[PDB]
Amino acid sequence: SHSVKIYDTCIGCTQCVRACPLDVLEMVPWDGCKAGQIASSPRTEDCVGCKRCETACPTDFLSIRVYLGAETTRSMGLAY
Ligand code: SF4
Ligand code: SF4
């Protein structure tokens, strides 16, 4: 698992929207879900790159951006 930006990658696995004691992967405006809302991380104001998510969808999507333990230079967690 790598990166977890705001993507409309959701099917109904529940995963990703569970492993997060900080509550990052929240509900966003989408047009595909039963409630036209995709589980993404819009307000990542709270998240110090913890080890929980590591399950952002099957990766079938997840725009090729990479982030999780990738750069951690300016977006480490606070520096951002
Ligand atoms: S690092 Fe932790 S708080 Fe941040 S997205 Fe992953 S599970 Fe949620
Ligand atoms: S891993 Fe991908 S399908 Fe599953 S709950 Fe998260 S967004 Fe939805």
Side-chain angles (χ1 to χ4, degrees), residues 9-17 39 55-58:
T9 182
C10 195
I11 57 95
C13 89
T14 216
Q15 107 199 6
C16 100
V17 192
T55 191
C57 243

Side-chain angles (χ1 to χ4, degrees), residues 37-59:
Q37 56 110 73
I38 214 115
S40 279
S41 311
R43 313 282 105 169
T44 302
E45 73 168 283
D46 278 300
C47 161
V48 66
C50 94
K51 236 218 245 221
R52 207 93 238 159
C53 40
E54 197 180 35
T55 191
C57 243
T59 322

Side-chain angles (χ1 to χ4, degrees), residues 4-5 44-45 47-50 65-80:
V4 58
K5 265 266 289 179
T44 302
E45 73 168 283
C47 161
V48 66
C50 94
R65 266 272 250 161
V66 176
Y67 251 113
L68 295 155
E71 218 71 272
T72 52
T73 288
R74 64 264 280 208
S75 200
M76 245 275 236
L78 149 280
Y80 90 125

